[PDB]
Amino acid sequence: IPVIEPLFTKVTEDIPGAEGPVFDKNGDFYIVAPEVEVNGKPAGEILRIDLKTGKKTVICKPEVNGYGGIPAGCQCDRDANQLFVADMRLGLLVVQTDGTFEEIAKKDSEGRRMQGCNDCAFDYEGNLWITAPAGEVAPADYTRSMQEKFGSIYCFTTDGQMIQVDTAFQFPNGIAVRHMNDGRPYQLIVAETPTKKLWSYDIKGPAKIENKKVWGHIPGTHEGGADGMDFDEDNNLLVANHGSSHIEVFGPDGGQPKMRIRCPFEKPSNLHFKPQTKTIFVTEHENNAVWKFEWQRNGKKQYCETLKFGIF
């Protein structure tokens, strides 16, 4: 498998569990520190990063009823400059740039207790596909599906429904949506970390997925596996292979990686493209830092970059 070794330029450091890199509608960059703890208890943070200086500013330290969150994944909304954050203790949060937030769901559409989330992906229709590797949200005792298969998948629809679309995953992690050229969502890809697998489904409609299938295989026998993911403008899927020192590159059809990207660290966690560029910002857990490197092409436009009132 061809392996490229681009130059990684340091962005910022010392972010415990450095995760969920994201750009908002203004081009501002955000990172979440899920593993920040105070006295041994969760006290995760959502930070804004000045790309010019690398200086960190924590805008939100989410907590509901004394229970601190473990914010791990992000997506920027389109109709409003706000962030949808997957939290391992609080579920789905909507965080404003001013630092204020709101917990989206205590229970799903079936009245079942919500599970802690890790990452999410907006389809062009506005539906948010979320991975829930943890057990029930706070105040429930913290649990995560690294060893047992109780991880779930949700779809938070445009009409405000938190619908559980599947379960029994061994730590569902990164997630991405494949769209047709005309913009129609048609395939959901989900990473199952420890199993070294990437799963896929046919998106039949909002919160409607069918035909679960092992779409791709993650290299290595190291502890870890597929973490964060995203598509480039050509629909190639870059996946951070946590613990492998590489970011895997899958073709439109999946299977085995058609290329790998060597990182100057062992634990790449998540990644995100800077709008209108080839620049990929990468978070990693070896040094708990953020880096950036140039990819061969631009990224696939995020839902937040699309237009509600566009013509084409």
Least distance from Ca ion to the Cβ atom of residue 110, Å: 25
- For the question of residue 222 being annotated catalytic, the response is no
- Nearest of 128, 192, 123 to residue 154 by alpha carbon: 128
The verdict on 230 binding Ca ion (CB under 5 A) reads yes
The verdict on 144 binding Ca ion (CB under 5 A) reads no
Is 210 or 234 the residue whose CB approaches Ca ion more closely? 234
The verdict on 285 binding Ca ion (CB under 5 A) reads no
Distance CA 216, CA 278 (A): 24
- Nearest of 121, 87, 123, 117 to residue 102 by alpha carbon: 87
The verdict on 292 binding Ca ion (CB under 5 A) reads no
The answer to whether 87 is annotated as binding is no
Of 173, 236, 241, 244, the one binding Ca ion (CB under 5 A) is 173
Is 171 or 215 the residue whose CB approaches Ca ion more closely? 171
In sequence order, the 6+-apart residues with CB closer than 8 A to the CB of 152 are: 115, 132, 164, 166, 167, 168, 169, 172
Q: Note the Cα 14 to chain centre separation in Å.
A: 20
Backbone torsions φ then ψ of 171, nearest 5 degrees: 70, 70
Least distance from Ca ion to the Cβ atom of residue 177, Å: 12
In the set 179, 242, 246, 285, the catalytic residue is 285
Of 272, 285, 292, 300, the one binding Ca ion (CB under 5 A) is 272
Distance CA 162, CA 129 (A): 10
The answer to whether 188 is annotated as binding is no
Q: Are strands 225-231 and 162-169 parallel, antiparallel or unpaired?
A: unpaired
Q: Which residue is nearest to Ca ion (CB)?
A: 272
The answer to whether 198 is annotated as binding is no
* Dihedral over Cα of 126, 273, 73, 267: its sign: positive
**CA dist 298 → 8, 126, 210, 214, 278 (Å):** 17, 22, 30, 27, 4
The answer to whether 211 is annotated as binding is no
Site for Ca ion in 208-227 (CB under 5 A): 227
The verdict on 283 binding Ca ion (CB under 5 A) reads no
The verdict on 197 binding Ca ion (CB under 5 A) reads no
Site for Ca ion in 67-126 (CB under 5 A): 118-119
Q: How many residues bind Ca ion (CB under 5 A)?
A: 6
Least distance from Ca ion to the Cβ atom of residue 131, Å: 8
The verdict on 300 binding Ca ion (CB under 5 A) reads no
Q: Is the peptide bond before 139 cis (omega within 30 degrees of 0)?
A: yes
DSSP string, 179-206: E-TTS-EEEEEEEETTTTEEEEEEEEET
Distance CA 101, CA 239 (A): 29
Least distance from Ca ion to the Cβ atom of residue 295, Å: 13
Sole window of 33-41, 48-56, 107-115, 267-275 interacting with Ca ion (rule: CB under 5 A) = 267-275
The encoded tokens of residue 142 equal 């913290």
The footprint of Ca ion (CB under 5 A) covers 118-119, 173, 227, 230, 272
- Binding-site residue ranges for Ca(2+): 19, 118, 173, 227, 230, 271-272
Active site residues: 285
